[PDB]
């Protein structure tokens, strides 16, 4: 046999952890992304890029550690270790935020590798590729949020920093500056995620409560055999129940499970489209008719205008520390504030 | 003119009609506010 | 309220064009042998 065929044999051996040709891309990249996150969160600072402490070594906890984005002055530089910024100096690279681009790039290629793994394994075992197809939603979210959005903004600095509290700050920044909650694409994403959770719960519970009695045990799990040919629960009884409770019910199992694929995947894709818009500040920020009315009529008020006031507060109070490169100095007298607070 | 053998009938069952109408009407309800602005 | 004038026709067509597409397909399915 040729060396290519021998290598294919070895890569596709049946072992505890499947490797595959996709493994050559997936495993080094996924390992480097995860290891970079752990290394940065344990030992690396954000002092020179954000003015922040961001590691266990500095005293942060699991909620506050992060691998923070590079400084805004770096633009969209790849920040390669051998690049002109760090110039091969590992310590300076870490201090300049090279770990953020390191993680983002090795992670993107790791996602590519994992999807290729889905395809490869499906082909080898003879199943259809719908798991790989569904994984396109996480990939679309990751690309839109961590690459396209910063690429449309001034620099990597405004991408999410890899951390719990940093992600929370990302949420609040999007509310304050983009009015992201008002965006119908985020709304469709929310519908997809919450509806997916609803479907997950309702289907699990319906199956578990329409099981057939296939054993004498009061714990019903042992009464299923993976090689059995018969359905383990009564579709007829479940359909009757939901028809009489909610008015409509599934009657086709194949449609049911495809719908479970369709809902969350579509929702995430819609959210990604919205974020592509926000990359250009192309927001659903205002309703022009309401703004005209409110400008002319000081007694007109809605929850929309109230939320706009909240956004103005967020921007004014968070910008000076969240965007240190701007050198904002907002005198106390200019800060928006309500009475007494 | 010999007929084309690649023709196939097309279908949309009643449940699909209801699901599609629901999708369309809900999308309209969602986006109408932004169309009116 | 000073709304976008074209919003009315935009919404009407957004609803009607896909809905009529679906109705055509459904009725012609029902009429099949």
């Amino acid at each position: 046999r040729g060396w290519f065929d021998i290598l294919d044999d070895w890569l596709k051996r049946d072992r505890f952890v499947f490797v595959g040709w996709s493994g050559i891309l997936l495993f080094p990249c996924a390992y480097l992304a995860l290891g970079g996150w752990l290394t940065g969160t344990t030992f690396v600072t954000s002092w020179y890029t954000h003015g922040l402490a961001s590691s266990y070594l500095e005293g942060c906890n699991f909620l506050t550690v992060a691998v923070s984005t590079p400084a805004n002055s770096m633009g969209h530089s790849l920040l390669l270790l051998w690049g002109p910024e760090a110039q091969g100096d590992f310590t300076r690279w870490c201090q300049l935020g090279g770990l953020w681009t390191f993680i983002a790039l090795h992670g993107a290629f790791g996602l590519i590798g994992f999807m290729l793994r889905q395809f490869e394994i499906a082909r080898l075992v003879g199943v259809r590729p719908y798991n790989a197809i569904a994984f396109s939603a996480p990939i679309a979210v990751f690309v839109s949020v961590f690459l396209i959005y910063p690429l449309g903004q001034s620099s990597w600095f405004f991408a999410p920093s890899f951390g719990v509290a940093a992600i929370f700050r990302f949420l609040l920044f999007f509310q304050g500056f983009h009015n992201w909650t008002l965006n119908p694409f985020h709304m469709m994403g929310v519908a997809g995620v919450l509806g997916g959770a609803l479907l997950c719960a309702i289907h699990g519970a319906t199956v578990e409560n329409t099981l057939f009695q296939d054993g004498e045990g009061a714990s019903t799990f042992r009464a299923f055999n993976p090689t059995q040919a018969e359905e383990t629960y009564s579709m007829v009884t479940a359909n009757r129940f939901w028809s009489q409770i909610f008015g409509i019910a599934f009657s086709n199992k194949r449609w049911l499970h495809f719908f479970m694929l369709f809902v969350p995947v579509t929702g995430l894709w819609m959210s990604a489209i919205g974020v592509v818009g926000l990359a250009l500040n192309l927001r659903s920020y205002d309703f022009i008719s309401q703004e005209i009315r409110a400008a002319e009529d000081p007694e007109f008020e809605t929850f929309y205008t109230k939320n706009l006031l909240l956004n103005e507060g967020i921007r004014a109070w968070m910008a000076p520390q969240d965007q240190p490169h701007e050198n904002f100095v907002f005198p106390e007298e200019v800060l928006p504030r309500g009475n007494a607070l | 003119m010999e007929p084309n053998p690649n023709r196939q009938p097309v279908e949309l069952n009643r449940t699909s009609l209801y699901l599609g109408l629901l999708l369309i009407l809900v999308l309209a309800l969602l986006f109408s506010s932004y169309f009116f602005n | 309220m000073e709304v976008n004038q074209l919003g009315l026709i935009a919404t009407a067509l957004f609803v009607l064009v896909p809905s009529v597409f679906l109705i055509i397909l459904y009725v012609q399915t029902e009429s099949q042998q």
Partner: peptide
């Protein structure tokens, strides 16, 4: 016009509920 549009769409959705529940294609066991 905008209020009429919103309410019209809502009423259509409710009618759709009615037909989808009471004029569904009946499930039939094989």
């Amino acid at each position: 016009m905008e209020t009429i549009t919103y309410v019209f769409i809502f009423a259509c959705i409710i009618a759709l509920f009615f037909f989808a529940i009471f004029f569904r294609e009946p499930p039939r066991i094989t």
